[PDB]
Amino acid sequence: TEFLKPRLVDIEQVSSTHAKVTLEPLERGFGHTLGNALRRILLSSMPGCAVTEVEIDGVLHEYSTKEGVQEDILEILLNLKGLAVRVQGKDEVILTLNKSGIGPVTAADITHDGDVEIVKPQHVICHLTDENASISMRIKVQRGRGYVPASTRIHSEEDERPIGRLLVDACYSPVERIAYNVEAARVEQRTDLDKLVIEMETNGTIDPEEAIRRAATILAEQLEAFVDLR
Amino acid sequence: GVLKIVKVYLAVKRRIQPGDKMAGRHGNKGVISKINPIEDMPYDENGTPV
Structure with missing residues (x-):
């Protein structure tokens, strides 16, 4: 047994999104x-936070049109799917978004929670055309892992079914x-003997070193079955 | 015989699944057979999945 273990040398962080290890x-x-x-x-197995529910005022469904807004509600939901958010303490946080007047509504217009960090504040959500127009919505971010569709989620739970809640x-x-x-x-x-460069291209939230640590943990926990149980 | 009519409009949002027919523009038909996970798909040296 010549057991020769590698070690983490260097993490070349070119950007907060892309980083070499x-x-x-x-x-x-x-x-x-x-x-x-x-x-x-x-x-596939990495945990992260993502927008699950939205609830816009003056909106009965995602297909309708809101006055004073260039985007149809679907295109706004699409922008919120890709909204970079990090919840530190809790698993579920519901953020409030109210904003008015002429300008592109950015991610920074959302009221930040004590333990919630919006990773790209300049991220576009909606475009207000009229000065008279104002938008109001409640964005629920929950934490999970992989990809959970709205079609997979509209056929399991559904205990409370409040009309005006966009999944x-x-x-x-x-x-x-x-x-x-x-x-x-x-x-x-x-x-x-050589090395192994893992080039990672992630959103904002999960940190390159942190993520590789978690992924090695998940592999070792699955190996418990082949080491312990024979 | 008709006193009144109520017309209701539904909006279905059907995503792709095995059985859906797809094609290019050179008459190349085909049916989705399986949606392979991203982890399983082929990827070039650059790392980008097909």
């Missing part, structure tokens, strides 16, 4: 073993694109 030294074959097995957990497809998983490479390490005299 270098990993060495890996013994021959483990580069692609962790590479793909990690990529899979990082695509939205949840884009929970924070990782958008991910691709691991394998490169020379140039360590001691190993030659064979």
Whole structure:
């Protein structure tokens, strides 16, 4: 047993969205073993927060039209699916959005909660054309993992069914694109032994190092079945 | 014989599923058979899934 474990070397953070993570030294074959097995957990299993429910005043359904607004309500919901939000303490937070007068309604117009951080404040939600026009809505962000559609969610729970509540497809998983490479390490005299560059392309919320830590945790917890139980 | 009529309008939002017919513009038909998860799809060196 020559058990040779890698260690986290360097996290080249080019942006808050895109960041490279270098990993060495890996013994021959483990580069692609962790590479793909990690990529899979990082695509699908990562927890994140996403807009689940919206409730706009003067809106009975998502197909209707609101006066003084360039976007139809569907296109506003679409913008809220992709609204970068981080809840620190609770799993569910309902944020309030009131705003009026001529201007593109940005994410910063939402009232920030004590433990809620809006990651892209300049994110467009709606365009107000008339000065007279004002918009009011209640945006529910919940935390989950993967992708939970509004069609998967409109056929399970549905205990309270309040008319004027617009459900939205949840884009929970924070990782958008991910691709691991394998490169020379140039360590001691190993030659064979190399490193593993995991290039991550995520939203704002989940932090590159944090995310890889969580993904390694999920893999090891699934391996409990093959180590403990024989 | 008709006293009054009420016309109700529904809006269905049907997403794609296996069985839906798709095609290009060169007469290349086809039926979705399975929606493969993103994790399983082929990806180029750049990392971008097909």
